[PDB]
Amino acid sequence: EWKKQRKDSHKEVERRRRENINTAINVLSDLLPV
DNA sequence: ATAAGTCACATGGTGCCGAGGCCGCTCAATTGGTCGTAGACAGCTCTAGCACCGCTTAAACGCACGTACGCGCTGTCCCCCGCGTTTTAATATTAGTGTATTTGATTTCCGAAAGTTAAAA
């Protein structure tokens, strides 16, 4: 049924968001003096 | 309108910190069990006892009594000490050295034990 697929896709996009935040934090951290 | 998307919310869970709760290792001497032998015993016979008379006269106890002997006696000699005093040496403190003991690791020592037999009234 389609509703579980909707939930799975929503979960996937949420995970992508969560990963993007960490990637941005890491690349920002790599530039700092310390 | 709705698939994508951001977002916060809500719950997940993973990690580290005590901590009170079980647990692990060891040695005391108990008691469990088991060999083998001191122990009490099993017919026993005869020892030196200990009466059990049955004498004798050698001790012995009293009968007498006697110097010896005692026991306080008594002038007096003496000596011990109660102090008083100077001494006087006994405190009782530190001390490090100089063996004195000393407790590990053997490491020989040697006689109790197991044959084997010498000797033994």
3-state class (DSSP) for residue A13? helix
Is the CB atom of residue A18 positioned under 7 angstroms from any atom of strand B?
Answer: no
Tokens coding A5: 């697929």
Angle at A3 between CA A12 and CA A17, to 5 degrees: 15
Q: In terms of residues, how long is chain A?
A: 34
Is the CB atom of residue A11 positioned under 7 angstroms from any atom of strand B?
Answer: no
CA distance A23 to A18: 9
Amino acid type, A13: V
Element (DSSP H or E) covering residue A25: helix A2-29
Alpha-carbon distance values, A21 to A2, A13, A17, A29, A34 (Å): 29, 13, 6, 12, 21
Is the CB atom of residue A10 positioned under 7 angstroms from any atom of strand B?
Answer: yes
Task: Report CA(A11)–C1'(B34) in Å, whole number.
Answer: 82
How was this model experimentally determined?
A: cryo-EM
Task: List the resolution, Å.
Answer: 3.4
Among the listed residues A16, A20, A23, the one whose alpha carbon sits nearest the alpha carbon of residue A8: A16
User: From the alpha carbon of A16, which nucleotide's C1' atom is closest?
Assistant: B5
